[PDB]
Structures are given as structure tokens and as C-alpha cells.
């Protein structure tokens, strides 16, 4: 493509040097795929080899987007983002529609191929350097830097925003009810249409974007495949902050009423208007744990009142756009995971529960990875930004295998926890 | 001895300027010694004279070694180094021999002038200027620059490897069979070509390099293969560690123990069963180099154990990509582990161990899991794949644990090895309380000042006991109360405690610990048939709590 307007001048935060991040070691298989991909990109002007005078580095990974046959390069621009986008969230920020979360169906479209046309600022190219590593330190890595807007960079859709809103406008006029939102490499398209028409309307957009130059390889063929559900089609109407259920038993043992209640007494840190005392008067006899204790009048009156009080959500819990989002996840067994998204402790902006299957075909790391992506997509749709996870996993075993079931293009901030709670079935 | 290599463009740190430091006192007659070197360097085009205009002088030194037939002189560039840009960092680690492939023949070439053979960027040479001051009254001294990569300079290492790499490309592309490794001023060439063609090919490579001003030798090595490379010993069919010696003393300084634990770690890559438990537990604190540390009794057995291993020599085999990559782990009881990596029954590619100094309450299955983690990383570095594991654990015991553990855990394909000591689960807490079993409402309390406390219990059978405590803390009494209930109860027992801490230790199912109390409790839990531990809010609880808590 012809070089358009000269390269958009890109500056960074005052006194912030480029990213200098070490390159994770990779399998031979991945280095091979990374090599093919890069000599193919270099062959197309997208990237160029660099010298020892470029001291910066940004990690690279080989994932499998279609995971069918061919690989896909995933640059991790988390560090460079923090060093540039913080002044490209300000200088060129894309506005986040608060209505996207209310649409009946939201489809995600990868439009990452768009950027590969536009040149990047010559003076800025240096900071996009990445290294294809060598096994056993045989050869110093293969070093490239970008010549066009890199995928994974937040600064790319910011620079491409005008061109994108222009391509989209003649579709937004025909369909004024459809909310379209560009987060990085993806468009989030949400309509209140019925499922059948919503997909037909997405295909109209795919073809519209195509006859203006943009490809969107995520579709494959809808005609004749084997049994396989779509990659991404969300329904944010379901997404709320779920209430915590108390055990429904026909009779109660001391132990039952002692494991009481499912986060009560700590729920008093979430729902402050709770009295447990007239339930604590139901034992006081140094009883055998397995002994059955009958209900009294005042005991039921502090249960029924402490039950409908949990189905009435917290008050004063609002989103703070200056505070980062925090997502904690708890492994629950039986192929199930519970999570919470918050900013200040016990003030939950969102809670949900991921569920894969009964088991015997899916391991922990796969589940957690899918859960982190699943949560992150909720965070994007809802607040326009991603959370910082506190993962129930050893650091190195995540840093080894996270890229194995990672189908997403963005990457959230990690963090690893070491102390388990008693708050397992408290959720 | 220089070449028309494309120089690499170099900048200074954005706001900085060239170094304008000097040296006033001189070294007497050692000035003309620096003259003889410079003119001979100038004639070779390495340096160039210049008049003192817009100069950035850099201090100059001269130094002879013992019986030096030829003097050697060099410039301290630390100030300039602080002012020049950062580069792409040179080779982090080194290629580990266990992951090299065997060849019919290998050669090693030492590049001559190395740094002075590669030109320096023109617009940057102004900053490498230095002076040769003569006599007094500030008479016009001799001032030069550098036309090539200066010896000590910050950019010399990375620029050289960049040049060398570019220079090898028109030969590597004329020789796909030959593989070449670069490393510092060294070059390590190998091939499966028959020794005739290989000797010719090495000679072609030399003549290539020589026409690019890089001098290389025809016969230089003071010692032939095996190669005394990097603490290693590389033979044509095997690799091993360059011989190390564990020195014997009567008194041990921290530095000497610092050296010893390093020489042992460096040996642990091939010599199986090396231990650094009590030898490292001495360097825990307080750290002071010249301080003399008394050698403990257990630390002396360990050293004796390691000496017995280091006695006879052991070697490792190289990598065959066509054959499986197996790794097997053995437990060594005291929190330490060992592993071997191999493709063949009687030879190892390498060995190694796992530290495990995390926390004060740990578990055998978790430790094993961390070992599989450490090895998978090491495998991915050296060979670029993950090994098939051979592990001393039943699949029932593994399955039970990861299903029960709060963290996510993953483990690649692994097979059980019946060879003891096995990794078991020495006890499992009941998930539900036990009908017919006595209930022990325990609680422990203490004073953080008097350091006195009480550990007691009260049961549903009406039984009660309270034991006084000294030298204790609220966390010690909270566990002592549990331990007491176990002592006094039958083969099945329900225990109720008000301590998140206590329940925390027990529910972690540790089989070993660094607390004698916790270990004793473990012994009881193994001996009991069924144990259910239950939690209850401390302050506002049932009422059987403050019955022994209000005693303190
Ligand atoms: C001190 C030193 C000396 C040399 C020559 C090397 N290089 C080197 N060593 C070996 N092993 C060896 C060492 C010493 C002796 C003796 N005597 C016999 C075999 N195999 C290769 O080359 C292996 C090439 C494998 N491939 C081929 C292409 O894909 C990438 C890697 N390169 C090294 C790494 C260190």
C-alpha cells in the first residue's frame, strides 16, 4: 500500500525510556514458527532487523489462534503500553460506550490486520524491538523492530481510530442501533436483535469492512464444519453481581449450624446489617457435632431475615475510573472456578463463576487460562479496561504454560498468590 | 589488521557530553613507553593524532606484568562508559554442554586483535580522545583518538559480536553443514564432514576471516581437546566438570563456606546426590565475610557425603535429538531432591537438585511438583523441549492431591517408579464430622509480654483439661491445644478450634516441618483413624471457647 500521511509523531511519558524486558525461553517448535512468521513479515516490509545499538526488548510468544495447523505471533506489549499508552489514553483515547454492556448479544471481531498498512514513526520504531531466542544460547537471538503499527500495541488503534470511524460510518447510518467499540485489535459489536438476525447483521459488517480493505480471518466457514461452537459471542445481559446462597436443609446438625453461614460473620463485612446472635443461642451446650439441633422461633427469624438480605445487592458500590480493577479467582474443584472483580475490598463490582465440564478432558491450567480470558472480556465490555489478576497458581508454572491455551491477542497484568483461604465454599 | 566493516552508529546519553577528565601526575620515564605503543598503533591505523581542539580527554595508564618483554598499556574508560548509550546486552548465559550435539570433529579459533580489528563510528570517535602530557609548563602534549573499538569501552563487546555475525554470514551461507558458535573473542566450529574436508573447511573459514582483518591461528592451543572451556571439560564423546577440590580446614570463614557451596553446586550438574542443606544453613546470617563460623555436626556429615561422591569421576553424554528425553526424580528426605536427565540407561545428559527453602511448613507432593517445574524450565532452556518424567509417586496419590489443592497445578506425562522412598499422603482429614466420635472444643491463649499461656480443651462427654505453658506465643498455644486434644482422644475425634492460623497449618496437610510441635501433631494425625477439624469464629462463638480462654 502507498504511504499515506507521514508517520504520526509518537512521544512517551517524560523521562521514561523504552521497554527492556528479557525474552522467555521457548520450545523448539515455537521458535521455528516464530522464525517462519518473521522472515515472512520482514519479506513484506512489516519489520526489519536491527543492530546492537537498539538496547530495547519486548517479549514474544507463539500461540495458536485457530490452533488447527498454523501458528500465530503474540507480542507482549504490556510494558511499552504502560510507557506510552498512558499518554495515548490521554492524547488519543478511544471513548468507552456505557451501553455496550446492556445489549442482548455482543460479537467480537478481530480487526488486527488493519494496522499492517500504516507506517510507524521512524524515531519510535526502536522501542518496538523483539527477540526470537535461540535454544541453549547457541546464537544471539534474531532481532527485529517494527516498521508498521504493531498488533498488541495500544497506540496502534489510537493512531488508526480516525480511519476506522470513517470506514464504520456508512454502516452506523444503516444500523444506528448497533453499538460498535474498538478495544485494541478487536471490535465489540452488540445488538438487541434476535440471534439469527444478529449474526446476519455481523456478516453485513464483515463484508462492509472487507470491501474497504479490512480482512477478518476469525470467521472461517459457517457452511460445513464438524461439531464446533463459535469462538466468541457474549451476552452481557446475564452479567451481574451474583448473591450468595445459604444451605437449604430439611434438618440441621450442630456442625451444619456452626459452619454458619456461607460467609456470614464475614458477610458482615459486605452486608453490614446482619445479626447472627440469636442463631448462636441455638447451641451453647458443648454438643456433639453430629447431634441434630431443632429450630427455635428466634433462630428462624435470624435466618429468613438473613437470607432475603443477601439477595438485595450492596449499596454504594460504584466504578472508580481512577482506580485499577482487581480480579481474584478461586479454584472450586469439579471443573469449576469462582471469581470477583473489585477495586476496594468487599466492594464487588462484579462476581461470576466459570464452568468447563465434569472433567477428565480438561486440566487446571487450561481452565484458569480460559477463565482469565473470559473475565477479561467481561472487563473490556463493561468498563473498557482489563483487570489485574491475583492467580491461584505458582509463578513459574503459569509463566511456562499460560501461552498454551491462550487464544486472545491482548494480555492482562498478572500476579500470583501463595496463601489459601477458608473462603472456598463461602462463595 | 583492520577492515572495511560497516560501523555501527553510536549515540551518547541524550543530555550528556564527552568526558573531559584528565591526569595531572605522571609516571616519569613511562611516558615514552606509551609513545612507542601509540605510534605503532597509529601506523596500524588503530588510532590517530589530533590537535587539542574541542577535546574530551580520557585518563591514560601504563602497566607491566612480571618479566614483561613487551609492555601493555590501556585507558580507563569508566567515565565515558557512564556517558555512552546502552546497547543490546551480550550473551546472558553460556551453552550448556549437556545440550550440545556430537560431531566427528570440532575446532576452536581465537580471533586476534578482536576489538581493534573492528572500526568505530566516525562521528563518535571524538569522545575517545586522550592525552600524553610531556614535562612541565603545559608543553603541547600528544593527543590521539580511536578509529576502532576501544578495549575497555562499553560498546566494544556488542558491536564486535554484531560485526563478527555479519562477517560469518557470507560463509555460513556457503556452508550449511558447518555450524559455528560465537562466544567472546572465541569461535567454535564443528561438522560431521570427514576430517579431510573439515581441515580444509576450517582453513577456508580462516582465510575468509583474515581478509576481513580478523587474525586467526593455524597452531595456537597450549592444550588440545579435551577443551578447558568454562569450568567444563569437553571430550569428543563426553563432557564433564573441570576438576574441583573441596579444601580441608580446621576453621571456616564465611567466604570459605561461600566458596565451598558454589564449588558443590557447580559439581551437582553431573555428580548425583550432592547435598547443600546444612552447608548452606550456615550462611543464613548474620552475614560477615571474615567471620569464623563453627561447623555443625550435620554439616560435617554432608561434606563427608559429598566428598565420598566427588571421589570417583563421573561424566555426561551429549544430546541425540532422535531419542527420547527422560528425567527422573529421587527424594532425599531432609527437604532436598535430586534428578537425572537422560536418553540412555547408563549415561546421563546431566543431573541436578532442588533447593526448597521456602516457608516453614511444607509438603512432599507439592515439593515434587516444584521439582517438575524447575526441571521443565531447565529442559526448555537447554534442549528446547520438555522431558518425559519418571516419578516416585502413585497416580492415585497425585490425583487425590491436585484435586484437593487450592492452587492450579499442571504436570506433563509421567510414569510411576516403584523405587522407594515413595511419595505418600500420610493422613487425610475427614470432610464431614464423625458420628459417635468425641468432640474436643479446644482453645489456646497467651500473653505477648509475660510469654505465658494456656492450652486446654472441653469435650461433649464433659471432660476438661488445662495445661500451663511457658516460652510460648498465641500461635504456639493455638496448636498446643489441638495437639493436646489428639493426645487425649480415641482413634476417631472431632476437634473444634477458633484459630484461622491453626486450621491453616493442619489443612495444608504438611508431612514435615521446621517446628517440633507441628511434627508431633503430624505423628498423631497419622496414628488416628478419623479426624475432623472444624472452624468457628473466635470472639463470638458457641460458648465452649471462652471456658479456657478467660483463664488467660
Ligand atoms: C569450548 C567449545 C568448543 C566447541 C568446538 C564448541 N562447539 C561445539 N561443540 C560440539 N560438541 C563437541 C565438543 C567437543 C568435542 C571434542 N573434542 C566434540 C564434540 N558440537 C557443536 O556443534 C553442534 C551443532 C548442532 N546443531 C546443528 C544445527 O542446529 C543447531 C545446532 N559445537 C563449544 C560449544 C565449546
Structure description:
The complex is a heterodimer of chains A (427) and B (552). Chain A is of the alpha+beta class. Chain A contains seven helices and 13 strands. Chain A folds into four domains: 9-98 and 124-164, Roll (HIV Type 1 Reverse Transcriptase, Chain A, domain 1), CATH 3.10.10; 99-123 and 165-233, Alpha-Beta Plaits (2-Layer Sandwich), CATH 3.30.70; 234-319, 2-Layer Sandwich (Alpha-Beta Plaits), CATH 3.30.70; 320-427, Reverse transcriptase/Diguanylate cyclase domain (Alpha-Beta Plaits). Chain A is elongated and about 85 Å long. Helices cover 27% and strands 19% of the residues of chain B. Chain B has helices spanning 30-43, 78-83, 156-172, 195-211, 254-265, 297-310, 364-382, 395-404, 474-487, 500-507, 516-527, 546-549; strands at residues 60-63, 72-75, 105-110, 130-134, 139-144, 179-183, 186-191, 232-234, 239-241, 326-331, 337-342, 350-354, 361-362, 388-391, 414-416, 438-446, 453-459, 464-469, 492-497, 512-513, 530-535. A five-stranded mixed sheet of chain B has the order 12-11-10-14-15, with helices on one face. A five-stranded mixed sheet of chain B has the order 18-17-16-19-21. Chain B has a three-stranded antiparallel sheet with strand order 3-7-6, covered by helices on one side. In chain B, α9 (474-487) packs parallel to α11 (516-527). The radius of gyration of chain B is 34 Å and the shape is elongated. Chains A and B meet through β10, α6 and α7 of A and α3, α7, α8, β16 and α10 of B. The structure holds the ligand Cc1cc(C)c(Nc2nc(Nc3ccc(C#N)cc3)nc(OCCCN3CCOCC3)n2)c(C)c1. Residues 95, 100-103, 106, 108, 179, 181, 188, 190, 225, 227, 229, 234-236 of chain B line the site of ligand 2RS. The ligand Cc1cc(C)c(Nc2nc(Nc3ccc(C#N)cc3)nc(OCCCN3CCOCC3)n2)c(C)c1 is lined by residues 95, 100-103, 106, 108, 179, 181, 188, 190, 225, 227, 229, 234-236 of chain B. Chain A: Residues 44-234 form the Reverse transcriptase domain.
Amino acid at each position: 500500500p502507498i504511504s499515506p500521511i507521514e508517520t504520526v509523531p509518537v512521544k512517551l511519558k517524560p523521562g521514561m525510556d523504552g521497554p527492556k524486558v528479557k525474552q522467555w525461553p521457548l520450545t523448539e517448535e515455537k521458535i521455528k514458527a516464530l522464525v517462519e512468521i518473521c522472515t515472512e513479515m520482514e519479506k513484506e516490509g512489516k519489520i526489519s532487523k536491527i543492530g546492537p545499538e537498539n538496547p530495547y526488548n519486548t517479549p514474544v510468544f507463539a500461540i495458536k489462534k485457530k490452533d488447527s495447523t498454523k501458528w500465530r505471533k503474540l507480542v507482549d506489549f504490556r510494558e511499552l503500553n504502560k510507557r506510552t499508552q498512558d499518554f495515548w489514553e490521554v492524547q488519543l483515547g478511544i471513548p468507552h460506550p456505557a451501553g455496550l454492556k446492556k445489549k442482548k448479544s455482543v460479537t467480537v471481531l478481530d480487526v488486527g490486520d488493519a494496522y499492517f498498512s500504516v507506517p510507524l514513526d521512524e524515531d519510535f520504531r526502536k522501542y518496538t524491538a523483539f527477540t526470537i531466542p535461540s535454544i541453549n544460547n547457541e546464537t544471539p537471538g534474531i532481532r527485529y523492530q517494527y516498521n508498521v503499527l504493531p498488533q498488541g500495541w495500544k497506540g496502534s488503534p489510537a493512531i488508526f481510530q480516525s480511519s476506522m470511524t470513517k470506514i464504520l460510518e456508512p454502516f452506523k447510518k444503516q444500523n444506528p442501533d448497533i453499538v460498535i467499540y474498538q478495544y485494541m485489535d478487536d471490535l465489540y459489536v452488540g445488538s438487541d436483535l434476535e440471534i439469527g438476525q444478529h449474526r446476519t447483521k455481523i456478516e453485513e459488517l464483515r463484508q462492509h469492512l472487507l470491501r474497504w480493505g479490512l480482512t477478518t480471518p476469525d470467521k472461517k466457514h459457517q457452511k460445513e464444519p464438524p461439531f464446533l461452537w463459535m469462538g466468541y459471542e457474549l451476552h452481557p445481559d446475564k452479567w451481574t453481581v451474583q448473591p450468595i446462597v445459604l444451605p437449604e436443609k430439611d434438618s440441621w446438625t450442630v456442625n451444619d449450624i456452626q459452619k454458619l453461614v456461607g460467609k456470614l460473620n464475614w458477610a458482615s463485612q459486605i452486608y453490614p446489617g446482619i445479626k447472627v446472635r440469636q442463631l448462636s443461642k441455638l447451641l451453647r451446650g458443648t454438643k456433639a457435632l453430629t447431634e441434630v439441633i431443632p429450630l427455635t422461633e428466634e433462630a428462624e427469624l435470624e435466618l429468613a431475615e438473613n437470607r432475603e438480605i443477601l439477595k438485595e445487592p450492596v449499596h454504594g458500590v460504584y466504578y472508580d475510573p481512577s482506580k485499577d480493577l482487581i480480579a481474584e479467582i478461586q479454584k472450586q474443584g469439579q471443573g469449576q472456578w469462582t471469581y470477583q472483580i473489585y477495586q476496594e475490598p468487599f466492594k464487588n463490582l462484579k462476581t461470576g463463576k466459570y464452568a468447563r465440564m465434569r472433567g477428565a478432558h480438561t486440566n487446571d491450567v487450561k481452565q484458569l487460562t480460559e477463565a482469565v480470558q473470559k473475565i477479561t472480556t467481561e472487563s473490556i465490555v463493561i468498563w473498557g479496561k482489563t483487570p489485574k489478576f491475583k492467580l491461584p497458581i505458582q509463578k513459574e508454572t503459569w509463566e511456562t504454560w499460560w501461552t498454551e491455551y491462550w487464544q486472545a491477542t491482548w494480555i492482562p497484568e498478572w500476579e500470583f498468590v501463595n496463601t489459601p483461604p477458608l473462603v472456598k465454599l463461602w462463595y | 589488521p583492520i577492515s572495511p566493516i560497516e560501523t555501527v552508529p553510536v549515540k551518547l546519553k541524550p543530555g550528556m557530553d564527552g568526558p573531559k577528565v584528565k591526569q595531572w601526575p605522571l609516571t616519569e620515564e613511562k611516558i615514552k613507553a606509551l609513545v612507542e605503543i601509540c605510534t605503532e598503533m597509529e601506523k596500524e591505523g588503530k588510532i590517530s593524532k589530533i590537535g587539542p581542539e574541542n577535546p574530551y580527554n580520557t585518563p591514560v595508564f601504563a602497566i607491566k606484568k612480571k618479566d614483561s618483554t613487551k609492555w601493555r598499556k590501556l585507558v580507563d574508560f569508566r567515565e565515558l562508559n557512564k556517558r555512552t548509550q546502552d546497547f543490546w546486552e551480550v550473551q546472558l548465559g553460556i551453552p550448556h554442554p549437556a545440550g550440545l550435539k556430537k560431531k566427528k570433529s570440532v575446532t576452536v579459533l581465537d580471533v586476534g586483535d578482536a576489538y581493534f580489528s573492528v572500526p568505530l563510528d566516525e562521528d563518535f570517535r571524538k569522545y575517545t580522545a586522550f592525552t600524553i602530557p610531556s614535562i612541565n609548563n603545559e608543553t603541547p602534549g600528544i593527543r590521539y583518538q580511536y578509529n576502532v573499538l576501544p578495549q575497555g569501552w562499553k560498546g566494544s563487546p556488542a558491536i564486535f559480536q554484531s560485526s563478527m555475525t555479519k562477517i560469518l554470514e557470507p560463509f555460513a551461507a556457503q556452508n550449511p553443514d558447518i555450524v559455528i558458535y560465537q562466544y567472546m573473542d572465541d569461535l567454535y566450529v564443528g561438522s560431521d564432514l570427514e576430517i579431510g574436508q573439515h581441515r580444509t573447511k576450517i582453513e577456508e573459514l580462516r582465510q575468509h576471516l583474515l581478509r576481513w582483518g580478523l587474525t586467526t591461528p593455524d597452531k595456537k592451543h597450549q592444550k588440545e581437546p579435551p577443551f578447558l572451556w568454562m569450568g567444563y571439560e569437553l571430550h569428543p564423546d563426553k563432557w564433564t566438570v573441570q576438576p574441583i577440590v573441596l579444601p580441608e580446614k580446621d576453621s571456616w570463614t564465611v567466604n570459605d563456606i561461600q566458596k565451598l557451596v558454589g564449588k558443590l553446586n557447580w559439581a551437582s550438574q553431573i555428580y548425583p546426590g550432592i547435598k547443600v542443606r546444612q552447608l548452606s544453613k550456615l550462611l543464613r546470617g548474620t552475614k560477615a565475610l571474615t567471620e569464623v563460623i563453627p561447623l555443625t555436626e550435620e554439616a560435617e556429615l554432608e561434606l563427608a557425603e559429598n566428598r565420598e561422591i566427588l571421589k570417583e569421576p563421573v561424566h555426561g553424554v551429549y544430546y541425540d535429538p532422535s531419542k527420547d528425553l527422560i528425567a527422573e526424580i529421587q527424594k532425599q528426605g531432609q527437604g532436598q531432591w535430586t534428578y537425572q536427565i537422560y536418553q540412555e540407561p547408563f549415561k546421563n545428559l546431566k543431573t541436578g537438585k532442588y533447593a526448597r527453602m521456602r516457608g516453614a511448613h511444607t509438603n512432599d507432593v507439592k515439593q515434587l511438583t516444584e521439582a517438575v517445574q524447575k526441571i521443565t524450565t531447565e529442559s526448555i532452556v537447554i534442549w528446547g523441549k520438555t522431558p518425559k518424567f519418571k516419578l516416585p509417586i502413585q497416580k492415585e496419590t497425585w490425583e487425590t492431591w491436585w484435586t484437593e489443592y487450592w492452587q492450579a497445578t499442571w504436570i506433563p506425562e509421567w510414569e510411576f517408579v516403584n523405587t522407594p522412598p515413595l511419595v505418600k499422603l500420610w493422613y487425610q482429614l475427614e470432610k464431614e464430622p464423625i458420628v459417635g466420635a468425641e468432640t474436643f472444643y479446644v482453645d489456646g491463649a497467651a500473653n505477648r509480654e509475660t510469654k505465658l499461656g494456656k492450652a486446654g480443651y472441653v469435650t461433649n462427654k464433659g471432660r476438661q483439661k488445662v495445661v500451663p505453658l511457658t516460652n510460648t506465643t498465641n500461635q504456639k498455644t493455638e496448636l498446643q491445644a489441638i495437639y493436646l486434644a489428639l493426645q487425649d482422644s480415641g482413634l476417631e475425634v472431632n476437634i473444634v478450634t477458633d484459630s484461622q492460623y491453626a486450621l491453616g497449618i493442619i489443612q495444608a496437610q504438611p508431612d514435615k516441618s521446621e517446628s517440633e510441635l507441628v511434627n508431633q501433631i503430624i505423628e498423631q494425625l497419622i496414628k488416628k483413624e478419623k479426624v475432623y477439624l472444624a472452624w468457628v469464629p473466635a470472639h463470638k462463638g458457641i460458648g465452649g471457647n471462652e471456658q479456657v480462654d478467660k483463664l488467660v
